[PDB]
Design an enzyme around this catalytic site. Structure first.
Site: not given
Ligand SMILES: [Cs+]
Ligand SMILES: [Cs+]
Ligand SMILES: [Cs+]
Ligand SMILES: [Cs+]
Ligand SMILES: [Cs+]
Length: 138
Positions: A7, A9-11, A14
């Site tokens: 995902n 959109a998830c730190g 990342r």
């Protein structure tokens, strides 16, 4: 041969992905929200991660709230099938390497299953130092 259920959109996801890359390999990236694992595959992933089915559930996402999943009223297979039908319920990221599979929360858990050491210092997005240039965990 490395797979990440990612995902963007998830730190945490990342950070995990960049730590994989910092070990010298580009993983296969599965955008689980769009291409979730099959039932068989999800059952296997949970088994290998050594966590409970409930420990895999993402809290604070719409189906978790609306389906009332916080309540202890669901068998493991009920929860598996909700994850398949509503992939946003699958917490992130799951990483598979030849050494094992982990839910990489916090991201630095991935260091357990990466075969090759970090190639140099790693600092998370927010500035949290993880490994120094010598390779020591901080
Ligand atoms: Cs699949
Ligand atoms: Cs929605
Ligand atoms: Cs390792
Ligand atoms: Cs190093
Ligand atoms: Cs953070």
């Amino acid at each position: 041969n490395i797979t990440i259920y990612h995902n963007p959109a998830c730190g945490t996801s990342r950070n995990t992905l960049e730590m994989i890359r910092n070990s010298g390999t580009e993983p296969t990236i599965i955008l689980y929200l769009e291409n979730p694992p099959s039932r068989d595959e999800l059952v296997k992933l949970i088994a290998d991660m050594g966590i409970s089915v409930r420990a895999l559930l993402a809290k604070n996402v719409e189906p978790y709230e609306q389906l009332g999943l916080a309540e202890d009223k669901f068998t493991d297979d009920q929860l598996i099938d909700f994850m398949l039908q509503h992939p946003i319920l699958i917490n992130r990221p799951i990483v598979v390497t030849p050494l094992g599979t982990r839910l990489c929360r916090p991201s630095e858990v991935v260091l357990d299953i990466l075969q090759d050491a970090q190639k140099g210092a790693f600092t998370k997005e927010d500035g949290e130092k993880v490994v120094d240039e010598a390779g020591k965990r901080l």
